[PDB]
Amino acid sequence: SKPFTVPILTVEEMSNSRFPIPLEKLYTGPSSAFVVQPQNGRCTTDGVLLGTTQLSAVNICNFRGDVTRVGISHDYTMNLVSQNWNNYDPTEEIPAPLGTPDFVGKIQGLLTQTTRADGSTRAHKATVSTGSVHFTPKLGSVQFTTDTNNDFQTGQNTKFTPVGVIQDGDHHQNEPQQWVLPNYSGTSGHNVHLAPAVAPTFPGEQLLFFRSTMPGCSGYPNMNLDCLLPQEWVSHFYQEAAPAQSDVALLRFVNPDTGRVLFECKLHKSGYITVAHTGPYDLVIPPNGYFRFDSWVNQFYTLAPM
Amino acid sequence: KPFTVPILTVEEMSNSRFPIPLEKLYTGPSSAFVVQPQNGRCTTDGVLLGTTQLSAVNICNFRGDVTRVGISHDYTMNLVSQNWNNYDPTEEIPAPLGTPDFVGKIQGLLTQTTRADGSTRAHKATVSTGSVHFTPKLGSVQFTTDTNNDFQTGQNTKFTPVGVIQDGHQNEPQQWVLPNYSGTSGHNVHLAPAVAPTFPGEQLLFFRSTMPGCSGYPNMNLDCLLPQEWVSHFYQEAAPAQSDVALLRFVNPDTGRVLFECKLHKSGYITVAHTGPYDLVIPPNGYFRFDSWVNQFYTLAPM
Ligand SMILES: C[C@@H]1O[C@@H](O[C@H]2[C@H](O[C@H]3[C@H](O)[C@@H](O)[C@@H](O)O[C@@H]3CO)O[C@H](CO)[C@H](O)[C@@H]2O)[C@@H](O)[C@H](O)[C@@H]1O
Ligand SMILES: C[C@@H]1O[C@@H](O[C@H]2[C@H](O[C@H]3[C@H](O)[C@@H](O)[C@@H](O)O[C@@H]3CO)O[C@H](CO)[C@H](O)[C@@H]2O)[C@@H](O)[C@H](O)[C@@H]1O
Fold this sequence. Notes:
Oligomer: homodimer
CATH topology of the largest domain in chain A: Nucleoplasmin-like/VP (viral coat and capsid proteins)
Number of helices of chain A: 1
Largest sheet of chain A: 8 strands, antiparallel
Radius of gyration of chain A: 20 Å
Bound molecules: a molecule of 3 linked components (GLC-GAL-FUC)
Order of helices and strands of chain A: EEEEEEEEEEHEEEEE
Number of domains of chain A: 2
Structural class of chain A: mainly beta
Helix content of chain A: under 10%
Largest interface: A-B, 51 and 50 residues
């Protein structure tokens, strides 16, 4: 059977799988107060994509479609199409289009448009509120607030490129809520075909997160964004499709400088990592450190404490 | 270690010269102009060239602190690295890794966080890479923004690119004209080499995207020589090249049939046997497959 491996890229050489930004650091913390059920960055170790996960970071939280103005406001409805501008199919057994945001928050970026007939183009600052009742990507539409009430044309290809997140109100860092899934069909129905929630089950363990800081674009947002797998690990597993020989892949995080192991962790075959630690901890690592697969173990493997 | 290329399809991959997905494959003549992109440059045995780095999401991004130019809407950014540490202008690269490698006006959002209270802000901004103030190899670039007062000094600031603009139709950007990374103060140095077919009957094969347009009538075509995922693959694998040319077959797995073959040169670009401009027609599941190392005298079947 094809030997299983993880990439040798360093943490800072990799990308967040939940927003199109680089990874910054490794983080572990308690998750008892949350349901940890992200839909992006979800892949089994033998390369089966889950949730809304697709293969490149540059498509995450992007939207494409045609737009129509909401009444006489500055808001626009986007009728979604696929990444390559073909019709979107709501009957596919996924929660929402691949790459759809998987948290409740207000994402700011630019909404851009081209007029096919003459090549004229335009761009406006725009925000999509994923907690809005008008955030219905599974049904095929989302709503943007923009800085125009007149410049976008109907029936023309329009793209949203995400940049960061915003916040409103006296309760600082109250949004985004990275561990709260949107209602992908709004009030019309419940979420479907979700990748499952993940949680540590073994005493003394926590999830290990790959952490980034989302750019902030207004107010006082919570800019923390944790993913379960780097995007490059998703791509690696998808391509290698190495069969899992047990429930858990034991990984060692190694310093090339000394050859020494810094810590070890459990990569569960369903695609998330646990470590033996309790409480919030920004891991202290050398920048050239990397993960190495060492052996196939089970869910009850007792790790060396972090 | 056996050489391989990724099995990802074209639309599963990213452009190595701007943070957007690949869309299609294109071949055409390029004798009449210089093809010398600096992003998406990597040898098959994993040596990064030009300004190439490993993530698609970092391309044409800028980070640093900003200062207003006079009381105008323009801001100078003093560049730092991806993780906010020093950029060393004496490093023998053309410019910071990920710097734009075309002359054009790139529009995006300039964002900032005030460390002390976590307040944040974002403004539409454009960087003109043909401007005399585009001097990333000196450690600074200039942005035109929609504000003349909201950005603070001494605060972490990021430019996220979105697309390109034009003034005047489709005369800019110029995707095959490198900017002057040091402006008027000096010539470009340490460039990845210009590429050209050397075998009669061959043309470059380009991995093509359409940059979003943000104003005016821009030329939105953007061609790279290698997908970003291939750069990262070669970097990681570091498989030795057994000759100067790797023969690839582009395969339809729905049928096992080869659609065309091509040459992947060790120094990191692809040629096909074709004369003229051509938009390739490929199945959605098609991918490239390394088959053998060939000598210098291999004739490709017509694409
Ligand atoms: C925190 C600021 O965010 C952006 O400006 C926003 C502007 O924020 C105001 C605050 O709401 C207010 O409490 C006080 O602090 O003055 C701020 C500036 O007016 O609020 C408007 C809507 O009311 C928008 O949300 C703006 O984005 C940013 O531009 C500022 O630099 C601050 O970081
Ligand atoms: C082509 C337009 O680009 C954006 O508008 C820009 C605006 O363009 C104007 C043209 O300059 C003018 O020739 C005429 O056609 O009206 C256009 C629209 O007002 O020019 C200003 C400053 O010169 C800005 O650059 C605008 O971005 C876009 O908003 C439009 O919808 C058109 O696509």
